[PDB]
Amino acid sequence: MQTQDYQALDRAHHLHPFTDFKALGEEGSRVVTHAEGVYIHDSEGNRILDGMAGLWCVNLGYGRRELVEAATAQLEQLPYYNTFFKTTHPPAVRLAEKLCDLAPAHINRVFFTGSGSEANDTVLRMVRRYWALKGQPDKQWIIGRENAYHGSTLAGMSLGGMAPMHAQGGPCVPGIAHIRQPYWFGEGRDMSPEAFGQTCAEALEEKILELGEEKVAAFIAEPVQGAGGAIMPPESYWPAVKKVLAKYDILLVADEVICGFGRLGEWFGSQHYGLEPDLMPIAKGLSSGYLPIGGVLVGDRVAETLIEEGGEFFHGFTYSGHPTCAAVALKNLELLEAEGVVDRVRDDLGPYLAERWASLVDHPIVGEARSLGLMGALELVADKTTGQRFDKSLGAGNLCRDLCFANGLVMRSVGDTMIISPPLVIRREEIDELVELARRALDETARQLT
Amino acid sequence: QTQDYQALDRAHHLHPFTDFKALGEEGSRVVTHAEGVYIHDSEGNRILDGMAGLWCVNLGYGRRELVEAATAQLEQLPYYNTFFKTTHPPAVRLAEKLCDLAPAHINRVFFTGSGSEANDTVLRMVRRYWALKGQPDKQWIIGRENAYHGSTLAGMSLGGMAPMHAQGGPCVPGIAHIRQPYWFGEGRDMSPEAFGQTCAEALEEKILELGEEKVAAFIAEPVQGAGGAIMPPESYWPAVKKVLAKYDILLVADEVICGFGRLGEWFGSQHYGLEPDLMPIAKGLSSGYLPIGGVLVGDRVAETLIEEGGEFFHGFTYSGHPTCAAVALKNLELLEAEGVVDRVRDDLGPYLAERWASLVDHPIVGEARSLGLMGALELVADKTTGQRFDKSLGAGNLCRDLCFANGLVMRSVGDTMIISPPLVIRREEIDELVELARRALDETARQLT
Ligand SMILES: *Cc1c(COP(=O)(O)O)cnc(C)c1O
Ligand SMILES: *Cc1c(COP(=O)(O)O)cnc(C)c1O
Ligand SMILES: [Cl-]
């Protein structure tokens, strides 16, 4: 089969995620066929540096023989069995042990799911079931943040703060509120980062008092916002949030679907900011994306009420704990740990990216460059003195994104914010190539718009 | 070791649909390997898996070809997203094969990871569709009591399980529930034919109660699975089609259990001559070997979404996962090349029915019903009246546990026993299933008397 054959069949039969179906059918889908290391290859023979590690998830890179062998061995032994029938299997047991041993203190149980979205559905039912069992059935409201992403189920979309998602397929799940996001560059340059972080934390208290603490069940947040644009909050934000949560009896849900398993230099983003969440949804890097699996790490406070008071929890998925997916996730975690990959993002690749990434701040159209661990972002501006954006209709970010791909680099755009999330095993020479290709695309972007 | 597995499992693993405390006290079963239609546990027991994992292992365990399909794709392209104006060969070929097997005018698929996520996709698609048609208040979805449509918030809301609705709500707004075509439990004051038409007429009443302008879709399993393997009277679906012909509402056929051979067709919709607008799928799509699901989308809905909708802000990281798709594709190729669906319809289905019917003369079996390789038995305390054992006696759970003790997985929904074995089960294995069931039925009857 030739590229156009794939494209024609794909156009005829395949509806892609988050896609303008009509536009893509007219321009023709890219066809990705194989990958190795940090590189992907398409049906036209192009080799591209995958600066997004698939979709924030291929932490150990492509071509890890050990993950292939883990799946093959489990498929030959027990490809599938359910965890419904008063049953478990060895992969589930061992993965839950390993996961909870890596989790922060007081987080000792896991409920398995297939995706980060199903994990957030699990979170929502667990949170509201929890308060019902506490004798407080009016404690129902969940506070998220604008521009947050918590998945694409109805619950995940409702918990998220994406207006274009909210505008499609609603009504949403009831009882979700949204406060402002700690995005200094886009929304806070009228203040010092420190003052802005405290304002955005105070917004949580304001929302609590607006709804009434007796009606609020939980606050949900990504430690660092991923899909919304790799937005690291000011250093003042999370300490001030902890101050607010200490005043009110509310659960903390840290959505670790992107930040988990090395991305920011820790096993969990919660650990980078010293949080103690009651629940933590996870997926993506859990298995380096090699097979689908997610879950909720459940803190002792929620777990004990559900166990001791709840009887049966009428919740779960056919593929919860899927033994082949669990076998792969277990091996992925063992490799991440045995090879010191997390320590290495934090002490080696993270700082190295930071210095190489910071060499882009002097580019004519880069208004800000930020990174943490192996997550990074650039802010494209038309005027550096004022920070003014290029006009929205010009699509500066999408143009830079397409020019990056044309130069051999996957670097995505959220509006006029460029983002990267490369595999955690990326080599220093490969980071060098990434920044060079980025600068080339930035050069070509600036020339075309001026 | 078994007790070592159990202690670690108790400490850290919260199971689906489980009384966490009770199971921790009793000790989890530990399943460790499987081949053919049999599973094995950490104590060395071989058990005939009359439920095919969870209604999903259609080609049975030990299929070398599915293992090789997974290994080859993991070595080629283990994962890549379909978000970035991108696709990959497995998604392309799987979408082609799937739509070629689907009913007429069902030519597109949106991939998901699970049947639950597929029903979330259904719900957003249905409501986005009518919004694009200029009817944004045409939002109500009519499901059925005792329906099962998954365990997301959307799936739980779409389902009709009161114990689920009672945990973690509020539900998604705008879902109504009409009565189920369960003749044995709820219709024995009528002929099956009249009952089937009454249950169809309940749909019309609900439409008129809500107002056709507010109703978006009717969602139903062709045959209810988790609710107790409830085949409707033969009058039901023809009468439902008459109602659907009169009103402008979408039909969603939830094929997560009925898809891919279970009833003797590629889709339960095809057994009943339905023309659905959307069909969520999962489970048998891959014989459960790897997680994957999706929504088969009819031309009516697809063209509106494509031509009017712009971007659909919906999807999952693992939508179209190329390793899972590669396995699903091979599963379909094997099911077709080996004539498994045809064999359910013409051989194993009819054979189960005759052997299954040999259980009707048992002292506590009030009804035996089957279709393809789905079957159910109704436990009763008195065959004259059909009355149940008191719920407090747990007749169904006792029979379930006695089946397992005899080497057979046969599930209980209240006092309804259900089976859904792999589609590659052989005739003598169907005999063994019925023989082992009878042993458990004898022992249940003795223990309850
Ligand atoms: C990816 C994303 C999700 C959704 O995960 P899926 O596997 O796509 O369902 C949830 N939370 C966050 C923070 C995410 O980035
Ligand atoms: C299994 C089931 C679902 C849910 O599928 P999951 O993969 O468990 O999320 C949906 N619909 C029906 C009819 C089912 O039996
Ligand atoms: Cl509000």
Among B10, B18, B331, pick the best mutation site for testing chain A contact (most A Cβ within 10 A).
Answer: B18
| Among A262, A329, A265, residue whose Cα is nearest residue A294 | A329
Is there a contact between B190 and B207 (Cβ–Cβ < 8 Å)? no
Residues of A in contact with B19 (CB under 8 A): 311-312
Tokens of B218: 């009717």
Is there a contact between B190 and B115 (Cβ–Cβ < 8 Å)? no
Q: What are φ and ψ of residue B49, in 5° steps?
A: -85, 85
End-to-end CA distance of chain B: 38
Q: Which residue do the tokens 């975690």 mark? A: A333
CATH number of the domain to which A195 belongs: 3.40.640.10
Q: Please report the DSSP string for A119-187 in residue order.
A: HHHHHHHHHHHHHHHTT-TT--EEEEETT----SSHHHHHHS--HHHHTSS-PPPSSEEEE----HHHH
CATH number of the domain to which A435 belongs: 3.90.1150.10
Tokens of A380: 């494209």
| Among A254, A314, A326, residue whose Cα is nearest residue A286 | A326
Within this chain, do residues A93 and A172 fall inside the same structural domain, yes or no? Answer: yes
- Dihedral sign for Cα B321, B324, B328, B333, please: positive
C-beta B225 within 6 A of ligand 2: yes
Chain A residue with the nearest C-alpha to that of B62: A76
Residues of A in contact with B88 (CB under 8 A): 31-33
Rounded to the nearest angstrom, the gap between the alpha carbon of residue A261 and the centroid of all alpha carbons in its chain is 11
Tokens of B332: 């379909």
Cα angle: A168, vertex A114, A182; to 5 degrees: 55
Residue A44 DSSP symbol: T
Residue A285 DSSP symbol: G
Final residue before a domain boundary, out of B314, B338, B362 = B338
Which residues have C-beta atoms less than 6 Å from ligand 1? Answer: A 115-117, 120, 149-151, 222, 226-227, 255, 257-258, 283-284, 294; B 316-318
Is there a contact between B420 and B55 (Cβ–Cβ < 8 Å)? yes
Query: Which residues face B178 on adjacent strands?
Result: B144
| Among A229, A379, A359, A64, residue whose Cα is nearest residue B78 | A64
Within this chain, do residues B155 and B274 fall inside the same structural domain, yes or no? Answer: yes
Among A215, A318, A333, A421, pick the best mutation site for testing chain B contact (most B Cβ within 10 A).
Answer: A318
Q: Which residue do the tokens 């000011």 mark? A: A234
Within this chain, do residues B302 and B352 fall inside the same structural domain, yes or no? Answer: no
Q: Classify residue A300 by burial, with Cβ atoms within 10 Å: 0-12, 13-18, 19+.
A: middle
Q: State in Å: Cα A157 to ligand 3 middle.
A: 16
Rounded to the nearest angstrom, the gap between the alpha carbon of residue B287 and the centroid of all alpha carbons in its chain is 13
Within this chain, do residues A58 and A75 fall inside the same structural domain, yes or no? Answer: no
* Contacts of B366 by beta carbon, 8 Å cutoff, 6+ apart: B184, B378, B379, B380, B383, B386
User: Is B317 annotated for ligand binding?
Assistant: yes
Residues of A in contact with B128 (CB under 8 A): 168-169
Q: What are φ and ψ of residue A185, in 5° steps?
A: -60, -45
Question: How many angstroms separate the CA atoms of B336 and B58, rounded?
Answer: 12
* Contacts of B242 by beta carbon, 8 Å cutoff, 6+ apart: B200
* Contacts of A99 by beta carbon, 8 Å cutoff, 6+ apart: A110, A282, A295, A297, A333, B12
Query: Which residues face A294 on adjacent strands?
Result: A113
- From atom 11 of ligand 1, which residue's Cα is the shortest distance away? A150
Within this chain, do residues A98 and A167 fall inside the same structural domain, yes or no? Answer: yes
Residue B312 DSSP symbol: E
Within this chain, do residues B58 and B101 fall inside the same structural domain, yes or no? Answer: no
Within this chain, do residues A193 and A146 fall inside the same structural domain, yes or no? Answer: yes
Query: Which residues face A254 on adjacent strands?
Result: A221
Positions of E strands within B267-319 = 278-281, 293-298, 311-312
| Among B6, B53, B15, residue whose Cα is nearest residue B34 | B53
Question: How many angstroms separate the CA atoms of A108 and A269, rounded?
Answer: 17
Burial A415-449 (b: 16+ CB within 10 A, else e): bbbbbbbbbbbbeeebbebbbebbebbbebbbeeb
SS3 (DSSP) at B280: strand
B409–chain A Cβ distance below 8 A for any pair? yes
For residue A289, the distance in angstroms to the closest alpha carbon of chain B comes to: 6
Angle of helix A428-449 relative to helix A350-358, nearest 10 degrees? 30
Question: How many angstroms separate the CA atoms of B262 and A418, rounded?
Answer: 48
C-beta B149 within 6 A of ligand 2: yes
Q: What are φ and ψ of residue B301, in 5° steps?
A: -70, -45
Is there a contact between A41 and A35 (Cβ–Cβ < 8 Å)? yes
**Structural domain boundaries enclosing B420:** 1-62+339-449
> Taking the C-alpha atoms of B380, B386, B392 and B398 in order, what is their torsion angle to the nearest 10 degrees?
10
B76's enclosing H/E stretch is: helix B64-76
Residues of A in contact with B282 (CB under 8 A): 318
Query: Which residues face A218 on adjacent strands?
Result: A142, A251
- Residue A255 CA: nearest ligand 1 atom is 13
Within this chain, do residues B18 and B69 fall inside the same structural domain, yes or no? Answer: no
- Residue A225 CA: nearest ligand 1 atom is 13
* Contacts of B303 by beta carbon, 8 Å cutoff, 6+ apart: none
C-alpha pair distances (Å), B169 with each of B124, B173, B187: 19, 11, 31
Query: Which residues face A414 on adjacent strands?
Result: A417
Within this chain, do residues A257 and A303 fall inside the same structural domain, yes or no? Answer: yes
Within this chain, do residues A366 and A411 fall inside the same structural domain, yes or no? Answer: yes
C-beta B256 within 6 A of ligand 2: yes
Residue B275 DSSP symbol: -
> Taking the C-alpha atoms of A209, A215, A220 and A221 in order, what is their torsion angle to the nearest 10 degrees?
-10
H helices present in A339-426, as ranges: 341-344, 350-358, 396-406
Within this chain, do residues A27 and A55 fall inside the same structural domain, yes or no? Answer: yes
Cα angle: A289, vertex A80, A59; to 5 degrees: 10
- Residue A258 CA: nearest ligand 1 atom is 15
Tokens of A429: 């020479």
Mark the residues whose beta carbon lies below 5 A from ion ligand 3. A 177
Q: Which of A55, A57, A150, A412 to mutate to test the pocket of ligand 1 (most atoms within 8 A of CB)?
A: A150
Final residue before a domain boundary, out of B309, B338, B367 = B338
C-beta B257 within 6 A of ligand 2: yes
Question: How many angstroms separate the CA atoms of B185 and A200, rounded?
Answer: 56
Within this chain, do residues A321 and A355 fall inside the same structural domain, yes or no? Answer: no
Strand order in the sheet with A107-113: A176-179, A141-145, A216-221, A251-254, A279-282, A294-299, A107-113, B13-14
- Residue B117 CA: nearest ligand 2 atom is 9
Residue A100 DSSP symbol: H
SS3 (DSSP) at B264: coil
Is there a contact between B310 and B131 (Cβ–Cβ < 8 Å)? no
Positions of E strands within B10-148 = 13-14, 18-19, 29-35, 38-41, 46-49, 86-87, 106-112, 140-144
Amino acid making up residue A320:
S
**Count of the separate structural domains present in chain B:** 2
Question: How many angstroms separate the CA atoms of A226 and A258, rounded?
Answer: 7
Positions of E strands within B205-321 = 215-220, 250-253, 278-281, 293-298, 311-312
Query: Which residues face B215 on adjacent strands?
Result: B140
Final residue before a domain boundary, out of A317, A339, A361 = A339
| Among B268, B266, B273, residue whose Cα is nearest residue B258 | B268
Q: State in Å: Cα B370 to ligand 2 middle.
A: 20
Closest ligand relative to A80 C-alpha? 2
Range 345-384 of B in CB contact (< 8 A) with A:
none
| Among B49, B65, B67, B45, residue whose Cα is nearest residue B57 | B49
Among B2, B83, B318, B403, pick the best mutation site for testing chain A contact (most A Cβ within 10 A).
Answer: B318
Question: How many angstroms separate the CA atoms of B168 and B151, rounded?
Answer: 11
For residue B155, the distance in angstroms to the closest alpha carbon of chain A comes to: 9
Q: Please report the DSSP string for B407-436 in residue order.
A: TEE-EEETTEEEE---TT--HHHHHHHHHH
C-beta B226 within 6 A of ligand 2: yes
User: ω into residue B181 within 30 of 0, thus cis?
Assistant: no
C-beta A317 within 6 A of ligand 2: yes
A157–chain B Cβ distance below 8 A for any pair? yes
CB atoms within 10 A of CB A135: 8
Chain B residue with the nearest C-alpha to that of A308: B21
